[PDB]
């Protein structure tokens, strides 16, 4: 009986050779499913984007088309006609001119510097260093946006808009990203130059895009440009540019609280004077607060120099308080240059560290360098 | 019943080439053959027809030109009865012919076996080779001869049939499109010796010899730099994930340079070993 | 609820419900579908009246006395409502009297001689179509030189309708060793006369003439494999299927495997995978394992052929796991793949209800679901009709028995009927030939002398089946 | 010299015309090619067969009808205006008095030199069933021209739908050497010098090859460098499978 058993042992040995077929078959099915997915996707009739308007008792829904116009289609088998509401983004096939699929609901119009990001990279240690600077940000921003129940428990409205004050060279542009980073909020940069075009209807709808985007994206932080007079990014508005669009823009700013009634929307604005803009902006719903950046005093500027000394390379014996007393009223922009010029002499010394003697020549330089012209 | 058209390799290339001039321009031709109804259908030879002021239409058929051709087509024995016509149009979702609508009704009176063929792609062919024909059913498809007994019929499920704009009724009266190609004994050996995938023959001894070893002037020239190209391709993707985890968010990155430099190396070795492998017998 | 769905879809809906219903009454002689229901008969087309008439042949099969009286009004000399339906009456006598039709053999060949001269109409060949198929079944298993010569003159006429009937009629008389001279003669006529309904019937006829010859048929197999004709390669698989059936052979496996791969014809690849099941009829345990390897492919006809080929050997055998192999084929968007899948499921699931196979609940729901739903495929719901008709065939009783211990060898009538099912929408449904494989399951002692059929009781261990029937 | 490019549709239609006329071996078929001969590369965009009758036993017996040429040429003007007669083709391997005298007959309707083509209906040996031949005088001398098969974009794609490396070149290269061995033997028995003059000229084309031995090893050196890269191809597959093996061992644990 051993002749059959010993011969059967070869079958068990060849059984492991059958295992090589499963490796080739699975690798072959990956190529079959790949080409099979190609043939279906080789001929694409194309599909545009449209918004649902209203529903009809005939089981056909009206969808507005941006390049063309409102057109009624037939709903699919997996799409409910009653579940379609107003301003609902859905997919419509361009061949049969019928409803295809349903997309996700969010505001995504033409984006020029309008892209909503998440936790940009900034910290309070770099552009900070003042006690009142961080203290004013907490109550005006962090409290209403992160914990809206604080003001609702007291029966008072939460602050929405804010105006920044201070000497030139604050640097609040980089601080605006630190606000959204530590509060776990999305950052929104608004540029009035890209929202104004000469084509008919662009002076309105482009601002309406910001009006509609803030509804669903409300748990975020909005930062506006072109109005900043405080020395970070200095524009101070446009004479002819803001002489028209201001009626289509600043009007929708107050509509958020009055009409949309959306909370957790922090409008960060800044300027040293109100001239070109609406003199009525001081009313609630537009400007809810005024924050003033303290000037670079002795105690405030001394801690600013300690900020750059951490990322830079300094030697022993350097007095960080004495160097701050050698200069006068250096803002965040001037401190960076004194530190940059201090590293400039280190390159001529062929040294990776900035000697204390370089700081003595940096104070007598940058102070006289900025005074010229 | 209906008719199943069987276009050979000779008729398909001729009817196509006649309508390959221009996207907007339309032309027409005549099909000839000898067959019987009740399924089977053949096409012997075709020739293009002149274009009139109406372009493709029923009045565009010249009885003077058609009679002169049938006398000239008798010399080789290819003269047969008129089996239909073929036209050329850019194509649409329904009624690919922008002019002909009822013209087939006048064609059915002359010959009940006549059809109207329209080439949709017009040099757009991706390799599918999809052509459209037409036949007038008039009153039918109710208590009569049953057409959909042959091949690929009774279509129209939901809204998707063929182009998907036709659905059930197709062009007119559900003509039940059926098309099949065949190759005879002479067409089998001729095409494989002319065009199968790409024709390299007649160079057969120099086929891969001249294209590679004799093309070394600039082809693989500076193989040391060619090997440097494979280095930069591998070093780029291999640097991505060395931890076998999710870092740069990639999947096939290690397999991208694997398949690219594998075929290049396979070609580098075969050409190099066959340089002295031809054995031209140089001696001294 | 199945046959009341719609009156359209030409005959493909009417053929599905007529062929399926004819299986349920098979052997019980119940005409209620034709008689008691008027409208479903009138909605049929011309060639569609063949199924309505031939359905009675499956129903009345086994009647050697009144079987002729069922077709009496449609017999020649009584005329008929038309000449399309008259041809089905002569075929109905072929299903009932097959092998017993020596009396009808002289009766059916006289009609062929009358129409052997020529044909002026299309319905004339329809009368000859059903006559040639009826005499082929009546003379099936017996070599007759008169039937071979009578059908040979029909082949010379090159009929587009009865051309296949003459080839199938001669092949059933040549079953077994056959006539070696008829092998090369019918093979020569296939090369000389090129026709779809003819050469395809000749290719199947050249498969039937070689039965159990094994290596003796290799001379004809080599000529078909070397030729590039699509129809000659189609009959080459069935020639390998019939000769190499029964005891398995690895030489026939290597032939059917290389053809289903190298050749790009979907119809030939489908014929090669179906021909493999006829060789594997002995061992049904390895059949699903091979189908699982062929279940994943880019071609629909390859998966469609393996579907029905799986149910051939697994019909009356065990290994219920073949149902899970056919599950992904049920979800295939291809229309004809789901049709052959429902038929293959109907063969294995016979008498599998009542806590035997847990999958009987999903197959019973798909009967009414696919037919009433318009989102499914046309051929999918048309195959679900016969699928419900095969499990309920003969009144839930009859089963498909092929290569069992009772017969002891390959059943000739059962293997030929399954080959005809492989051709459905290519020309016209041949499913009426399947009635040869349906036999009832009964245990009775009768007597030791003559016919009795008494009534007694056993009371031994058995599963609960006969008292479990489809409910409302 | 010049070049000749023949489309596959011309040769496919020319072979079936031989069957349509039921021409046996005792007769041969003759036809006309159409195209543009103005450029250096002669291209045939159209062809049609002619009812050519010939006796094989008598080289002085031939039948060529010129009336069908004038009518067919006028009919093609309403089809394609860019197609003109560039010459004439013919069947059969042999060139006899029938094909040589008719070469000047088509010259009346052909502006440039008529292109001669020997069409093999049986397709005997190698490739190229039809060879390109040009007529030139010094006795009629027919010189061979390079014959390439090239079609349009949709023409090559349309044929692929109808039909839908190292060892290959070596087997095809050895057949060329075997054809040369029989070429010198068949020519030697015919004489007992013009072709041998061109053969002995290209035969000569390790004093100077002493430094040419290293170049063989220099290419073999890169082959191993390539095999080093070729080995890296499977070195990643060596790593790729362990990427699964770490997930494979985490399966039984979850079960």
Swiss-Prot record, chain A:
Organism: Saccharomyces cerevisiae (strain ATCC 204508 / S288c)
Stored Gene3D superfamilies: 1.10.8.60, Nucleic acid-binding proteins (2.40.50.140), P-loop containing nucleotide triphosphate hydrolases (3.40.50.300)
Assembly: May form a homodimer or a heterodimer with a related family member. Interacts with OLA1, TMA17, and UBR1.
Extra remark beyond the main annotation: Present with 4700 molecules/cell in log phase SD medium.
Protein's UniProt name: 26S proteasome regulatory subunit 8 homolog
Biological process, per Gene Ontology: chromatin remodeling; nonfunctional rRNA decay; nucleotide-excision repair; positive regulation of RNA polymerase II transcription preinitiation complex assembly; positive regulation of transcription elongation by RNA polymerase II; proteasome regulatory particle assembly; proteasome-mediated ubiquitin-dependent protein catabolic process
Record-linked InterPro entries: 26S_Proteasome_ATPase (IPR050221), AAA+_ATPase (IPR003593), AAA_lid_3 (IPR041569), ATPase_AAA_core (IPR003959), ATPase_AAA_CS (IPR003960), NA-bd_OB-fold (IPR012340), P-loop_NTPase (IPR027417), Prot_ATP_ID_OB_2nd (IPR032501)
Primary gene name: RPT6
Any GO MF annotation of the entry: protein domain specific binding
Curated annotation (Swiss-Prot), chain B:
Post-translational modification: N-acetylated by NAT3.
Enzyme class: hydrolase
InterPro entries membership: JAMM/MPN+_dom, JAMM_MPN+_peptidase_M67A, MPN, RPN11_C
Keyword RNA-binding: no
Residues binding Zn(2+): 87, 89, 100
Coiled-coil portions: none
Motif JAMM motif, residue range(s) on this chain: 87-100
Gene Ontology CC terms: cytosol; mitochondrion; nucleus; proteasome complex; proteasome regulatory particle, lid subcomplex; proteasome storage granule
GO biological process: mitochondrial fission; peroxisome fission; proteasome assembly; proteasome storage granule assembly; proteasome-mediated ubiquitin-dependent protein catabolic process; protein deubiquitination
MPN domain: residues covered: 5-140
EC number, UniProt record: 3.4.19.12
Similarity remark: Belongs to the peptidase M67A family.
Quaternary structure annotation from Swiss-Prot or TrEMBL: Component of the lid subcomplex of the 19S proteasome regulatory particle complex (also named PA700 complex). The 26S proteasome consists of a 20S proteasome core and two 19S regulatory subunits. Interacts directly with RPN8 and STS1.
Task of the protein: Component of the lid subcomplex of the 26S proteasome, a multiprotein complex involved in the ATP-dependent degradation of ubiquitinated proteins. RPN11 is the only catalytically active member of the lid and serves as the essential deubiquitinase of the proteasome.
Miscellaneous field: Present with 16400 molecules/cell in log phase SD medium.
Protein name: Ubiquitin carboxyl-terminal hydrolase RPN11
Species of provenance: Saccharomyces cerevisiae (strain ATCC 204508 / S288c) (Baker's yeast)
Gene that encodes the chain: RPN11
From Swiss-Prot, chain C:
PC repeats: 51-84, 88-125, 130-164, 165-199, 201-234, 235-270, 271-303, 305-339, 340-377, 383-419
Post-translational note: N-acetylated by NAT1.
SS bond list: none
Other noteworthy facts: Present with 4750 molecules/cell in log phase SD medium.
Biological function: Acts as a regulatory subunit of the 26S proteasome which is involved in the ATP-dependent degradation of ubiquitinated proteins.
Family: Belongs to the proteasome subunit S1 family.
Subunit structure as annotated in this protein's UniProt entry: Interacts with UBR1.
Protein's UniProt name: 26S proteasome regulatory subunit RPN2
Protein's organism: Saccharomyces cerevisiae (strain ATCC 204508 / S288c)
Gene coding for it: RPN2
From Swiss-Prot, chain D:
PTM statement from Swiss-Prot or TrEMBL: N-acetylated by NAT1.
GO cellular component terms, A-Z: proteasome complex; proteasome regulatory particle, lid subcomplex; proteasome storage granule
Keywords from the UniProt entry: Acetylation, Phosphoprotein, Proteasome
Keyword hit for Acetylation: yes
Domain of life: Eukaryota
MPN domain residues: 4-138
One of the GO biological process terms: proteasome-mediated ubiquitin-dependent protein catabolic process
Signal peptide: none
CDD domains: MPN_RPN7_8
Pfam families for this protein: JAB, MitMem_reg
Recorded GO MF terms: metallopeptidase activity
Job description of the protein: Acts as a regulatory subunit of the 26S proteasome which is involved in the ATP-dependent degradation of ubiquitinated proteins.
Family that this chain belongs to: Belongs to the peptidase M67A family.
Miscellaneous notes: Present with 19800 molecules/cell in log phase SD medium.
Protein name: 26S proteasome regulatory subunit RPN8
Source organism: Saccharomyces cerevisiae (strain ATCC 204508 / S288c)
């Amino acid at each position: 009986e051993q002749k059959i058993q010993e011969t059967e042992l070869k079958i068990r040995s060849k059984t492991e050779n059958v295992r090589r077929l499963e490796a080739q078959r699975n690798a072959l099915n990956d190529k079959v499913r790949f080409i099979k997915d190609e043939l279906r996707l080789l001929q694409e009739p194309g599909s545009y984007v449209g918004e649902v308007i209203k529903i009809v008792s005939d089981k056909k829904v009206l969808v507005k088309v941006q390049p063309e116009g409102k057109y009624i289609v037939d709903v699919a088998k997996d799409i409910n006609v009653k579940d379609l509401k107003a301003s609902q983004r859905v997919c419509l096939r361009s061949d049969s001119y019928m409803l295809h699929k349903v997309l996700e609901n969010k505001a995504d119009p033409l984006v020029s510097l309008m892209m909503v990001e998440k936790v940009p990279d900034s910290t309070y240690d770099m552009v900070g260093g003042l006690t009142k600077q961080i203290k004013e940000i907490k109550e005006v921003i962090e409290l209403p946006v992160k914990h809206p129940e604080l003001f609702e428990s007291l029966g008072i409205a939460q602050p929405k808009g804010v105006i920044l004050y201070g000497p030139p060279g604050t640097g609040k542009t980089l601080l605006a990203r630190a606000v959204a980073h530590h509060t776990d909020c999305k950052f929104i940069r608004v540029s009035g130059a890209e929202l104004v075009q000469k084509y008919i209807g662009e002076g309105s709808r482009m601002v309406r895009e910001l009006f509609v985007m803030a509804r669903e994206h409300a748990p975020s932080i909005i930062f506006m440009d072109e109005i900043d007079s405080i020395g970070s990014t200095r524009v101070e508005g446009s004479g002819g540019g803001d002489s028209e669009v201001q009626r289509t823009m600043l009007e929708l700013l107050n509509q958020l609280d009055g009409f949309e009634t959306s909370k957790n929307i922090k409008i960060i604005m800044a300027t040293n004077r109100l001239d070109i803009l609406d003199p009525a902006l001081l009313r609630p719903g537009r400007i809810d607060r005024k924050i003033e950046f303290p000037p670079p005093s002795v105690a405030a500027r001394a801690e600013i120099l300690r900020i750059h000394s951490r990322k830079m390379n300094l030697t022993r014996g350097i007095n960080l308080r004495k160097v701050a007393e050698k200069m006068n009223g250096c803002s965040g922009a001037d401190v960076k240059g004194v530190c940059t010029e201090a590293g400039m002499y280190a390159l001529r010394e062929r040294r990776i560290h900035v000697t204390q003697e370089d700081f003595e020549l940096a104070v007598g330089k940058v102070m006289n360098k900025n005074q010229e012209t | 019943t209906k008719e199943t058209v069987y276009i050979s390799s000779i008729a398909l290339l001729k009817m196509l080439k006649h309508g390959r001039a221009g996207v907007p321009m339309e032309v027409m031709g005549l099909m000839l053959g000898e067959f019987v109804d009740d399924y089977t259908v053949n096409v012997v030879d075709v020739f293009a027809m002149p274009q009139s002021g109406t372009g493709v239409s029923v009045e565009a058929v010249d009885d003077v030109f058609q009679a002169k051709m049938m006398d000239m087509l008798k010399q080789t024995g290819r003269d047969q009865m008129v089996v239909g016509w073929y036209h050329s149009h850019p194509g649409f979702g329904c009624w690919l012919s922008s002019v002909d609508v009822n013209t087939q009704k006048s064609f059915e009176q002359l010959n009940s076996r006549a059809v109207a063929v329209v080439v949709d792609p017009i040099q757009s062919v991706k390799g599918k080779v999809v052509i459209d024909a037409f036949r007038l059913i008039d009153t039918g498809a109710l208590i009569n001869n049953l057409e959909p007994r042959q091949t690929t019929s009774n279509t129209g499920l939901l809204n998707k049939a063929n182009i998907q704009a036709l659905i059930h009724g197709l062009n007119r009266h559900y003509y039940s499109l059926n098309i099949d190609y065949h190759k005879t004994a002479k067409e089998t050996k001729m095409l494989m010796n002319l065009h199968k995938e790409q024709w390299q023959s007649g160079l057969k001894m120099y086929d891969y010899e001249e294209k590679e070893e004799s093309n070394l002037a600039a082809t693989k020239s500076m193989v040391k730099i060619a090997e440097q190209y494979s280095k930069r391709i591998e070093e780029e993707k291999e640097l991505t994930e060395e931890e076998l985890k999710t870092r740069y968010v990639g999947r096939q990155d290690p397999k991208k340079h694997l398949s690219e430099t594998a075929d290049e190396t396979l070609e580098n070795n075969i050409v190099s070993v066959l340089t002295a492998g031809v054995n031209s017998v140089a001696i001294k | 609820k199945s046959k009341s769905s719609l009156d359209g879809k030409f005959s493909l809906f009417h053929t599905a419900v007529s062929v399926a219903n004819g299986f349920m009454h098979a052997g019980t002689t119940d005409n209620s579908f034709i008689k008691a229901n008027l409208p479903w008969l009138g909605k049929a087309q011309n060639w569609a009246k063949f199924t309505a008439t031939a359905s009675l042949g499956v129903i009345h099969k086994g009647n050697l006395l009144e079987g002729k009286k069922v077709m009496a009004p449609y017999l020649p000399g009584s005329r008929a409502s038309s000449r399309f339906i008259k041809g089905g009456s002569l075929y109905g006598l072929g299903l009932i009297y097959a092998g017993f039709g020596r009396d009808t053999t002289d009766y059916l060949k006289n009609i062929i001689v009358e129409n052997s001269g020529t044909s002026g109409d299309e319905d004339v060949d329809v009368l000859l179509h059903g006559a040639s198929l009826g005499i082929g079944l009546a003379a099936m298993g017996s070599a007759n030189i008169e039937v071979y010569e009578a059908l040979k003159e029909v082949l010379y006429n090159d009929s587009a309708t009865s051309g296949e009937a003459a080839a199938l009629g001669m092949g059933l008389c040549m079953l077994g060793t056959g006539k070696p001279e008829a092998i090369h003669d019918m093979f020569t006529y296939s090369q000389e006369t090129q026709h779809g309904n003819i050469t395809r019937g000749l290719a199947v006829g050249l498969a039937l003439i070689n039965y159990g010859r094994q290596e003796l048929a290799d001379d004809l197999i080599t000529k078909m494999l070397a030729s590039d004709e699509s129809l000659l390669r189609y009959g080459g698989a069935f020639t390998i299927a019939l000769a190499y059936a029964g005891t398995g052979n690895n030489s026939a496996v290597k032939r059917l495997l290389h053809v289903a791969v190298s050749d790009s014809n979907d119809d030939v690849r489908r014929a090669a995978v179906i021909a493999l099941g006829f060789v594997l009829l002995r061992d049904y345990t390895t059949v699903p394992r091979i189908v699982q390897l062929l279940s994943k492919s880019h071609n629909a006809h390859v998966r469609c052929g393996t579907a029905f080929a799986l149910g051939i050997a697994c019909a009356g055998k065990g290994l219920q796991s073949a149902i899970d192999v056919l599950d992904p084929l049920t979800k295939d968007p291809v229309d004809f793949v789901r049709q052959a899948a429902m038929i293959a499921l109907s063969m294995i699931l016979i008498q599998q209800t009542e806590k035997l196979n847990p999958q009987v609940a999903d197959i019973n729901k798909n009967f009414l679901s696919v037919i009433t739903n318009k989102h499914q495929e046309g051929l999918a719901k048309f195959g679900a009709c016969v699928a419900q008709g095969i499990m309920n065939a003969g009144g839930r009783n009859v089963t498909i028995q092929l290569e069992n211990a009772d017969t002891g060898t390959l059943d000739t009538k059962s293997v030929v009927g399954l080959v005809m099912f492989s051709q459905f929408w290519y020309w016209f449904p041949l499913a009426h030939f399947l009635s040869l494989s349906f036999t009832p399951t009964t245990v009775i002692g009768i007597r030791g002398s003559d016919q009795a059929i008494p009534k007694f009781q056993m009371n031994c261990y058995a599963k609960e089946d006969a008292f479990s029937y489809p409910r409302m | 010299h010049e070049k000749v490019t023949i489309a596959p549709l011309v040769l496919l239609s020319a072979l079936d015309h031989y069957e349509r006329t039921q021409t046996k071996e005792n007769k041969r078929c003759v036809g006309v090619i159409l195209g543009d001969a103005n450029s250096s590369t002669i291209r045939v965009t159209n062809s049609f067969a002619l009812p050519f009758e010939e006796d094989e036993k008598n080289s002085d017996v031939w039948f060529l009808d010129h009336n069908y040429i004038e009518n067919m040429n006028e009919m093609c003007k309403k089809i394609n205006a860019k197609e003109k007669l560039i010459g004439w083709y013919h069947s059969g391997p042999k060139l006899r008095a029938s094909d040589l005298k008719i070469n000047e007959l088509f010259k009346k309707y052909t502006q440039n030199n008529p292109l001669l083509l020997i069409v093999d209906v049986k397709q005997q040996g190698v490739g190229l069933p039809t060879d390109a031949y040009v007529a030139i005088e010094q006795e009629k001398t027919f010189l061979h021209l390079p014959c390439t098969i090239e079609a349009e974009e949709a023409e090559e794609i349309g044929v692929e739908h109808l039909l839908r490396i190292r060892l290959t070149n070596q087997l095809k290269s050895l057949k060329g050497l075997q054809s040369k061995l029989k070429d010198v033997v068949e020519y030697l028995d015919k004489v007992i010098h013009t072709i041998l003059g061109k053969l002995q000229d290209v035969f000569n084309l390790n004093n100077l090859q002493k430094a040419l031995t290293v170049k063989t090893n220099d290419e073999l050196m890169v082959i191993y460098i390539s095999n080093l890269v070729r080995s890296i191809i499977a070195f990643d597959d060596l790593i790729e499978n362990k990427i699964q093996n770490k997930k494979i061992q985490e399966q039984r644990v979850k079960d």
